[PDB]
Amino acid sequence: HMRKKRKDINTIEDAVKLLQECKKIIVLTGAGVSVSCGIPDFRSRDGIYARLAVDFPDLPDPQAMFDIEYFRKDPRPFFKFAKEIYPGQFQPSLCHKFIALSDKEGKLLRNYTQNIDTLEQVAGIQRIIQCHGSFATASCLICKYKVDCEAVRGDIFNQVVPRCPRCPADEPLAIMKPEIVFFGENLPEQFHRAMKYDKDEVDLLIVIGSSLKVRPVALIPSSIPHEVPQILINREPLPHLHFDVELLGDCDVIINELCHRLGGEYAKLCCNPVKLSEI
């Protein structure tokens, strides 16, 4: 029995009031929140999958780049590509900063992020779950030996398949896969434990910059109690879900507007242009 929309929650004014009153908010983010930072998303015309279709045409499809059964067959394309998506030196967006402030004020239950760019950490968001893992560690496909990212980093930027140092040198599949979640893999245990704790505590869900096309993250809106209000902030509507309020557009533009309506420290996040103040 899927989640219907609440008839009594509709407007941007309603959204502001909820942000004012709610104190256990889940923010579910996807690649859209980093687009303004200079990191393209996955599924848009200028995104990762479109690029992969051009730069790696031999793949059965762009998704195969992040598919565990394909990686097992041939990990060479991924290690040719991985440095392109390795965390760089980008600055967090306004949306990241907004989420960080909510957490600072004690109002953020969790930021479930699908991104591997680590910008939530840079922004000082603490209550993060990296749903789709990260490059922070790597794990041998065969024996599950773990290493820190610095152990495979050199190989990654040299576009070479890093080798397990424990397994036999003649074991073909003894390769160190960074612990980014691929299609066909489990999400980190942290995700499942956090969701079990959070689902009956959340009092507001805000989805920002995601197409919610991948499970189980895409199941979050239907897994929480139906009465919990849901707000979408995204360039595109999500026709497969029933949000209460749909704010469609650039997420920094929309969050900027919400921040000014909230006032207090939220308006202060938007330091450009400069507001009226005494020197």
Partner: peptide, 26 residues
């Protein structure tokens, strides 16, 4: 910020269209 960044187009009861919405694309 962008042209008319603080304005939206409203489709009642609950949809707001801001700068950058994909609906503006061709």
């Amino acid at each position: 910020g962008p042209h008319m960044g603080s304005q939206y187009l409203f489709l009642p009861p609950n949809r707001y269209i801001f700068h950058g919405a994909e609906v503006y694309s061709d």
